[PDB]
Design a binder for this molecule. Structure first.
Ligand SMILES: [Mg+2]
Ligand SMILES: [Zn+2]
Ligand SMILES: [Zn+2]
Ligand SMILES: [Zn+2]
Lengths: 260, 115, 96, 67, 35, 98, 46, 404, 51, 479
RNA sequence: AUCGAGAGGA
């Protein structure tokens, strides 16, 4: 009648991904945590671009969309920032945004590559991920002699549900019951299916025997970060956000029940 | 041209209620919970947690239309229980599980980082 | 002077004939553009090849839905002439 | 025309990979080896680089309107 | 001297490539107008 | 003006005898994509008349092998009457028999 | 009042008055392009 | 509103609908209503008319609404049935060994609009209570209607032997008192044919109950399909090596038989059948041999199919495809015809310059001995193109003739 | 015998499994561009005044 | 024949036909004869030898071209009438000896049988695995696809133009697409396509699209429209002038605001415009006095941004302006898409990444198409393309889908795919996005080249309530 | 705006 008691093991933890296993929880909770990884972990991304000059071969919306897709380090600032919609300020302010500027002109006969290195931030802690101390810089546009790009941009807090640019993940691997003991899939020819990396079976055995009393446990994750957040930070933020959603629903339901 | 704004899927429109409670008159001790601006995430977790409750006879949820942002949760309990109590207890259980998971993930991350 | 002749692009008498890709790009022309069309009042026009029966050849067709049992045909045409092609038919009457 | 910033399928950043990929190819890497070196494991990200056509160079071949 | 199958595929597509390097794809239009 | 009119309107003939003249020659070049342009520049037309309902002229004759594409043809009222050259097909320009 | 146009050939900016025929003062080219507006252009980076 | 797709061929090309407002820019239609309109979603456009007075609104409401149009007077049978996804999924759903857990049943009941709120007793109580798909579908069926049908794969000898009333293959659909007692549902039971379940629902209950029946079938079955899944891939186009060898042997034997017939005709040892000249008799024999070979290879391919094969699932449910499609994908494509005859000698005594003169063998005259998976040879490709051109032309001309 | 008519609309059709067979989904712009003349009565005067 | 092969007196274009049964020899030098090149076959051997291939490989340096092949009498042009007398080998394999010889008297050989196809049909991969009508349908849909139609599109003021943001070259190609320049100007994107039933919104030739992919630029395109206008001084009485009209002097001024115009009467590049906005201000003097408004307005329901404005003089010296307006088009429900195999459909719904089904890796499909197309359509080329595209994406090469290639069959591709850790038939275990549960059936999924067609719903949606009527009859206007 | 033509869509 009561809550589960999940346990966690971390098997791999690098700068770009975290691999871990959750045990003693329900499939619905695991899938909801995955979905929150993808869509409900807040991130800082460019969502407001003013173009002062653009002589490049790409039109303004092209450049703005590419800028919006540039990942920015949000590890600690994002929790502090308010949603611009919730801020009481004018257009933008330091409590709900980060200002960026770009001003590049090509005055030479060799092609000028405008990269995220040319995005100058007002906040030292919110910068393009590739501009952090190998990996090259993200190309924005290429300029030839006489062409120029000058713009002002603001980065705001958001999550992947609104737009994919606020999605912090670069692939969420999710898996349970590596050997098909629950028979949630049915292989017409089991022997010709490659083994899962989490499989614990001999090479002569294609799948585990059917388990009539089994339930999905031991969910396997590999969360890969796009660079805006650390993978462990992605996981912790997802847990906190799901908890916050449940708490808000609880408060609203309490008000509704008391109202009658 | 007819595209809805992206924020419409999670922002409540002025005057819209987050959650509404109605009685299911077909059978006793049954309630329908309509939640606005929520999707399969919350609906699925809440439904599964409710199914874990032995005093819950029926628990289910659905999204009436994918282009709308409403979920309906139907709960039936035994006469000694209430669907409202079951819903509240399910949310409390989910919050407790998530808090424990967060604590244990923090501990595991620290362990992995030290060695 | 007797008139003006529209010129097919990239032909022998177009200004783009035998130009390098660099020269074409200097003229704001796409090097991959194949040509083979005209520009009439700024509009790009392409001539569609038209099928016709070959000339100066004898063809024998049978038409039993007609008074002739068999019909020889020859669309005779000298090399060039403002006179159109001259068609001569030779037929044998249908029995009865 | 220009390398997309992200992989359409998973969102992995690929916009900082095109020049490196070109460099590896002229170093006599096979395309599969170059993609492995750049860390593109999923075949969606691999498609991103494999199928890209850098049309922006051809556009840069034209003189700009303003000097 | 003689082309063998394993060489034949490459040889035939080399011949086709040379053809298209010479003629292009709108040769009939240009040739007719030039005539 | 005669050449300009014939190329501009596609009516192959004098402007006064426009009803008598065959239309559809000299169409506007299609530029939706590069393949569209290439196909338009290699287009062939049978002047039979789309109104006719005899299947014989619209059928794929054996002699089209290697000369006319067996697949590319509009699927509407002109099916089988508008054709496209095969990749290696060429059309002779003529020469003196002397 | 100025109505600056950019010459298509020499890329020179030259004033053009209404009712004045289009012609570049430098090279005599007859094709000119209008300069980008000074109005505020703002895009969402979506 | 009045909804219409051109050409307007019969009454059910213009039907009344109730308006629902949705975000994006398209008209949205229920899948079952596509058949009356002959509509699909590959770029089709449809027209909407808004009646402007209470009288015209009442006329459309009382005469032309979709539920009233379910049965057509053209053939005293329904014009709307259950279609592709729902049909295939319901065929899979009503199989004997389909078992559902408590939560899955609860979800499916979530999607049942006419449900009275009572969870039926599971068919299996111990161990682990389990519901069958037939129980849920019985909950879907309206009223207490009685209907008997046969599944498409029902063997012909079953009704005469034992097990007539206890079907080993779970064919023999029986609905009694509104309950699906037995049988696998398919096009024959949920389609537009006379005497189907939907027809009996319309005749026994009103148009409103039948409308709810259509909608509930679709919603419940689609939500279950989210669990079951359905696909088609390369694996469904393959056959075992034994099947391939049998097909190759059949083709080789047919080719040798045609060679024997040709040799007989060349030595004047062939006699014309009554009412036919020698050439017609020879063509008849050759076409008989090739048709028999095609039928035999198709039967072999049919036999090779497993119960998991998705082509076969689609065909058996009646959702899409035929056994001929399977034969052509897995086994020979077959003979190509122009104007009801083998490929003509377009060249002089020759179908293509790659053959010798007076070659009447299967390859020369357009017998495609390859399957679509194997791929056609160039000559087979050209002959197949000729065949397809025939059908395109036929469409393009019949349209105007029939319109007049 | 045939005419062009007012109060009509046309657009592409797409599937919707979540509509009843007697329903049609209509885009907002189409619905906002077409009108039905409703007669004012004491029953509906408030609703129509709001409209 | 010797003379023609040596090119002494008879040019290559000349046709010489001998009718042996008859006693006629027909020679044609006329224009308009369709012909094709063929390899000449001697006793049972090609005249094309290894040395010719070696010389052609270095054609850049040794200036050895196709003309030299024709000059050496190794290739010949054959028209239809002469083809009637030719004994043609499909491949050099036909010239080999057999236990029972078929012909043994071949005169010519095909260079490659795939040359029977035209430009549009040459981009279909594995066309010999499809029903022919589907190849015919693709032959048109390819002409309707979006790409980069020409490299200098920035300088052309075409009436209509569509440009795709991120064209890709297909992972699976035919060898003849090299000469169509499809690599340089491709029209389409390689998409991760799953053939599955998922929520029912891809039924009856509809497709489900990934909204997160669309957010990232998947199949985003830009639409250009050009407006042209000129001011005419035809007569001393009436003259048209480009200017910003004022309501005091001009009469027929619509209620649209003319403040978007400059003092020259023209809008400036970078200005947002909507339906019924004036973009060219023009007045005509009368024979609100002395001027009648004749301004040009943006077409109703266009809503673009002014791209560039060009001003010139036309042939008669009158001032002439062209205005290009650009409109970014994000793929949405109702837009038309098609693979290269005649499989076309409109987008039925779009799901975000978390709602889409996923593999054990993070991979979700970009597009989900319905399995109920293949059975009746019999477009097996589509499935084989998906399999080979998965193989090629994993391996790092471009798959070869040239039609009549014996070196490529489904079993070899399947064996290659198994080597990379995938089910050999291209199937995969997918998890339901909504619940995370495994899907009982395994799903066919892989990269497939898809095209965005010019037919978009926002250019078709239309409704009317008592608008303008015709003059002669008072019935509603057309269009 | 009218007329014609052409190209397309279902
Ligand atoms: Mg259709
Ligand atoms: Zn603020
Ligand atoms: Zn990826
Ligand atoms: Zn100048």
């Amino acid at each position: 009648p009561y809550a589960n008691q999940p346990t966690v093991r971390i098997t791999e933890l690098t700068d770009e991904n975290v691999k871990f296993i959750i045990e003693n929880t329900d499939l619905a909770v695991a899938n909801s945590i995955r979905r929150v990884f993808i869509a409900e972990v807040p991130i800082i991304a460019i969502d407001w671009v003013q173009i002062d000059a653009n002589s490049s071969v790409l039109h303004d919306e092209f450049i703005a969309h590419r800028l919006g897709l540039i990942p920015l380090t949000s590890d600690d600032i994002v929790d502090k920032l308010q949603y611009s919609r919730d801020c009481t300020c004018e257009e933008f302010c330091p409590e709900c945004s980060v200002e960026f500027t770009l001003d590049v002109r090509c005055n030479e006969d060799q092609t000028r590559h405008v990269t995220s290195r040319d995005l100058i931030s007002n906040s030292p802690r919110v910068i393009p991920v590739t501009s952090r101390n190998e990996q090259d810089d993200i190309l924005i546009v290429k300029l030839r002699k006489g062409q120029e790009l000058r713009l002002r941009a603001y980065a705001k807090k958001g999550f992947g549900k609104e737009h994919a640019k606020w999605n912090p993940t670069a692939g969420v691997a999710f898996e349970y019951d590596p050997d098909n003991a629950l028979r949630h899939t049915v292989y017409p020819k089991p022997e010709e299916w490659p083994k899962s990396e989490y499989s614990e079976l001999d090479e002569d055995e294609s799948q585990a025997p059917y388990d009539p009393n089994g339930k999905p446990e031991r969910f396997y994750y590999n969360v890969e970060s796009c660079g805006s957040l650390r993978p462990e930070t992605i996981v912790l933020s997802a847990l906190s956000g799901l908890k916050k959603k449940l708490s808000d629903l609880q408060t609203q339901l309490s008000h509704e029940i008391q109202s009658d | 041209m007819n595209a809805p704004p992206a924020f419409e899927s999670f922002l409540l429109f002025e005057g819209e209620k987050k959650i509404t409670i109605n009685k299911d008159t077909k059978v006793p001790n049954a309630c329908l919970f309509t939640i606005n601006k929520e999707d399969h995430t919350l609906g699925n977790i809440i439904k599964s947690q409710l199914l874990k409750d032995p005093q819950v006879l029926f628990a289910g949820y659905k999204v009436p239309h994918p282009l709308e942002h409403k979920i309906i949760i139907r709960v039936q309990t035994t006469p000694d229980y209430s669907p409202q109590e079951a819903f509240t207890n399910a949310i409390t259980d989910l919050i407790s599980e998530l808090s424990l998971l967060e604590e244990r993930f923090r501990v595991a991350i620290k362990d992995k980082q030290e060695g | 002077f007797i008139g003006k002749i529209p010129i097919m692009l990239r032909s022998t008498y177009c200004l783009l004939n035998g130009l390098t890709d660099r020269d074409l790009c200097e003229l704001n022309e796409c090097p991959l553009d194949p040509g083979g069309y005209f520009i009439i009042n700024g509009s790009e026009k392409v001539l569609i090849a038209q099928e016709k029966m070959a000339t100066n050849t004898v063809y024998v067709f049978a038409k039993k839905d007609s008074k002739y049992a068999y019909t020889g045909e020859c669309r005779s045409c000298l090399e060039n002439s403002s006179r159109p092609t001259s068609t001569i038919w030779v037929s044998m009457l249908a029995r009865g | 025309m220009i390398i997309p910033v992200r992989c359409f399928t998973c969102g992995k950043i690929v916009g900082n990979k095109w020049e490196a990929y070109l460099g590896l190819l002229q170093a006599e890497y096979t395309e599969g080896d170059a993609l492995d070196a750049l860390g593109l494991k999923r075949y969606c990200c691999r498609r991103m680089l494999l199928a890209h056509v850098d049309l922006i160079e051809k556009l840069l071949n034209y003189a700009p309107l303003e000097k | 001297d003689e082309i063998t199958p394993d060489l034949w595929q490459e040889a035939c597509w080399i011949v086709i490539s040379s053809y298209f390097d010479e003629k292009g794809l709108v040769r009939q239009q240009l040739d007719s107008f030039d005539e | 003006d005669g050449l300009k009119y014939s190329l501009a309107t596609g009516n192959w003939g004098d402007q006064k005898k426009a009803h008598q003249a065959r239309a559809g020659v000299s169409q506007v070049l299609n530029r939706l994509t590069f393949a569209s342009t290439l196909s338009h520049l290699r287009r062939l037309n049978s002047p039979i008349g789309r109104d006719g309902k005899l299947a014989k002229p619209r059928q794929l004759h054996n002699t089209l092998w290697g000369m006319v594409c067996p697949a590319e043809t509009p699927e509407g009222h002109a099916v089988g009457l508008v054709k496209n050259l095969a990749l290696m097909a060429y059309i002779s320009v003529g020469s003196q028999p002397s | 009042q100025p109505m600056i146009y950019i010459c298509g050939e020499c890329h020179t900016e030259n004033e053009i008055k209404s009712r004045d025929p289009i012609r570049c003062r430098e090279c005599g080219y007859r094709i000119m392009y209008k300069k980008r507006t000074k109005r505020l252009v703002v895009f969402d980076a979506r | 509103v009045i909804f219409n797709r051109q050409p307007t061929l019969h009454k059910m090309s213009m039907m009344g609908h109730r308006v629902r407002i949705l975000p994006w820019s398209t008209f949205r239609l229920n899948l079952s209503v596509t058949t009356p309109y002959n509509a699909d979603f590959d770029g089709d456009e449809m027209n909407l008319h808004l009646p402007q007075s209470l009288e015209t609104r009442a006329e459309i409401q009382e005469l032309a609404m979709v539920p009233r149009m379910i049965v057509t007077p053209q053939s005293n049978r329904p014009v709307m049935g259950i279609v592709q996804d729902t049909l295939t999924a319901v065929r899979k759903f009503t199989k004997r060994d389909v078992f559902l857990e408590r939560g899955e049943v609860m979800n499916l009941l979530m999607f049942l609009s006419t449900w009275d709120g009572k969870v039926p007793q599971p068919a299996i109580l111990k161990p682990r209570p389990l519901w069958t798909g037939k129980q849920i579908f019985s909950l879907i069926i309206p009223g207490h209607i009685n209907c008997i049908r046969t599944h498409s794969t029902h063997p012909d000898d079953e009704d005469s032997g034992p097990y007539k009333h206890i079907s080993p293959g779970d064919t023999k659909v029986v609905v009694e008192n509104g309950e699906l007692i037995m049988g696998i549902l398919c096009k024959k039971s949920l389609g537009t044919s006379a005497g189907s379940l939907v027809h009996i629902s319309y005749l026994e209950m009103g148009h409103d109950i039948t409308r709810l029946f259509y909608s509930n079938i679709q919603t419940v079955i689609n939500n279950w399909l989210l669990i079951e899944g359905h696909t088609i891939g390369i694996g469904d186009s393959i056959a075992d090596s034994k099947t391939y060898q049998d097909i190759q042997n059949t083709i080789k034997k047919a080719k040798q038989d045609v060679i024997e017939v040709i040799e007989k005709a060349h030595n004047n040892e062939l006699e014309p059948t009554p009412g036919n000249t020698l050439r017609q008799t020879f063509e008849n024999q050759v076409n008989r041999i090739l048709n028999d070979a095609r039928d035999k290879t198709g039967s072999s391919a049919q036999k090779s199919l497993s119960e998991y094969n998705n082509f076969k699932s689609m065909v058996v449910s009646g959702a899409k495809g035929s056994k001929i499609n399977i034969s052509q994908v897995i086994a020979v494509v077959g003979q190509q015809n122009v104007e009801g005859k083998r490929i003509p000698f377009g060249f002089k005594h020759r179908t293509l310059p790659h053959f010798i003169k007076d070659d009447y063998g299967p390859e020369s005259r357009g017998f495609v001995e390859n399957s679509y998976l194997a791929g056609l040879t160039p000559t087979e490709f050209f002959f197949h193109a000729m065949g397809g051109r025939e059908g395109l032309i036929d469409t393009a001309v019949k349209t105007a003739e029939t319109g007049y | 015998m045939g005419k062009r008519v007012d109060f009509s609309a046309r657009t592409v059709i797409t599937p919707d499994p979540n509509l009843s067979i007697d329903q049609v989904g209509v885009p907002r712009s189409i619905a906002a561009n077409m009108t039905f003349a409703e007669i004012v009565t004491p029953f509906n005067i408030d609703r129509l005044q709001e409209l | 024949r010797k003379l023609r092969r040596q090119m002494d007196i008879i040019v290559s274009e000349v046709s010489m036909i001998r009718d042996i049964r008859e006693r006629e020899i027909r020679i044609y030098t006329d224009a308009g004869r369709i012909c094709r090149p063929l390899l000449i076959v001697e006793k049972q051997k090609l005249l094309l030898k290894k040395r010719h291939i070696d010389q052609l490989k270095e054609r850049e340096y040794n200036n050895y071209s196709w003309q030299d092949l024709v000059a050496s009498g190794v290739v010949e042009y054959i028209d239809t009438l002469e083809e009637e007398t030719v004994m043609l080998a499909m491949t050099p394999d036909d010239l080999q000896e057999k236990e029972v010889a078929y012909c043994s008297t071949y005169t010519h050989c095909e260079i490659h049988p795939s040359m029977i196809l035209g430009v549009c049909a040459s981009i279909i991969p594995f066309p010999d695995h499809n029903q022919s009508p589907r190849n015919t349908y693709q032959s048109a849909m390819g002409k309707q696809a979006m790409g980069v139609y020409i490299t200098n599109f920035h300088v052309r003021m075409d009436t209509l133009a569509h440009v795709l943001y991120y064209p890709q070259k297909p992972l699976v190609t035919t060898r003849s697409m090299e000469y169509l320049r499809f690599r340089e100007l491709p029209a389409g994107i390689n998409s991760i396509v799953a053939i599955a039933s998922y929520t029912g919104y891809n039924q009856e030739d509809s497709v489900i699209m990934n909204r997160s992919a669309v957010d990232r630029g998947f199949f985003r395109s830009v639409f250009y429209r050009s407006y042209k206008e000129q001011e005419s001084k035809k007569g001393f009485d009436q003259e048209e002038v480009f200017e910003k009209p004022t309501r005091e002097t001009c009469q027929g001024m619509r209620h649209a605001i003319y403040d978007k115009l400059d003092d020259d009467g023209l809008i400036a590049p970078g200005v947002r415009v909507s339906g019924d906005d004036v973009i060219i201000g023009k007045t005509v003097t009368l024979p609100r006095y002395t001027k009648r408004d004749c301004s040009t307005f943006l077409r109703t329901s266009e809503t673009g941004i002014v791209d560039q404005v060009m001003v010139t003089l036309n042939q008669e010296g009158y001032k002439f302006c062209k205005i290009r307006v650009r409109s970014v088009r994000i793929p949405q429900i109702g837009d038309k898409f098609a693979s290269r195999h005649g499989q076309k459909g409109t987008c039925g719904i779009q799901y975000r990444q978390e709602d889409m089904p996923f593999t054990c890796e993070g991979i979700t499909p970009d597009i989900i198409i319905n399995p109920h197309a293949i059975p009746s359509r019999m477009t097996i080329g589509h499935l084989i393309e998906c399999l080979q595209g998965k193989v090629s994406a994993n391996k790092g090469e471009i798959g070869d889908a040239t039609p009549f290639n014996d070196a490529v069959n489904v079993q070899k591709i399947s064996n290659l795919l198994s080597d990379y850790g995938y089910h050999l038939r291209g199937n995969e275990v997918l998890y339901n996005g909504f619940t995370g549960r495994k899907i009982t059936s395994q799903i066919f999924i892989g990269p497939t080249y898809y095209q965005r067609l010019k037919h978009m719903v926002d250019d078709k949606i239309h409704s009317r309530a008592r608008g303008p009527i015709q003059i002669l009859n008072r019935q509603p206007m057309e269009g």
